[PDB]
Design a binder for this molecule. Structure first.
Ligand SMILES: [Ce+3]
Lengths: 60, 60
C-alpha cells in the first residue's frame, strides 16, 4: 500500500543519492526527502509519495 | 481561501473550547486542535480544515 510504497521510495531515492558526491547533493533534494520523511512519520503516506516525486525531479 | 478558513476555524473552535471547564476538555479535542495547528504550520491548510472537523466532532 501507500505506507509500503512510501518506505520503499525513500530507500530508493536515498540509494540513488548515496551514489552522488555529498557536496553535489542539491538542497532542494534534501528538503524534499525531509518532507517525505516528515509526512511518513505523520502517517500521511500519500503525501510522502508526492514529496518523493519532488525529490526525484531534484536529482541531477 | 483555505489558509484563511483554517485560521478562522482554529479561532472559532478555541472560542467554543474556552467556554468549557478546562478539566472537561476531552483529550481527543486537544489532539485534533494540535493536528490542525501542525498542518497549518506546514502550509497544508486543507488538512487543517479536515482536522478541525474532527475537533468539532469532539466537542461535548
Ligand atoms: Ce502533514
Amino acid at each position: 500500500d501507500d505506507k509500503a510504497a512510501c518506505a520503499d521510495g525513500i530507500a530508493a531515492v536515498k540509494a540513488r543519492v548515496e551514489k552522488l558526491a555529498p557536496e553535489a547533493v542539491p538542497q532542494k533534494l534534501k528538503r524534499a526527502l525531509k518532507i517525505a520523511e516528515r509526512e511518513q512519520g505523520e502517517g500521511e503516506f500519500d503525501e510522502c509519495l508526492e514529496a518523493l516525486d519532488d525529490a526525484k525531479r531534484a536529482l541531477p
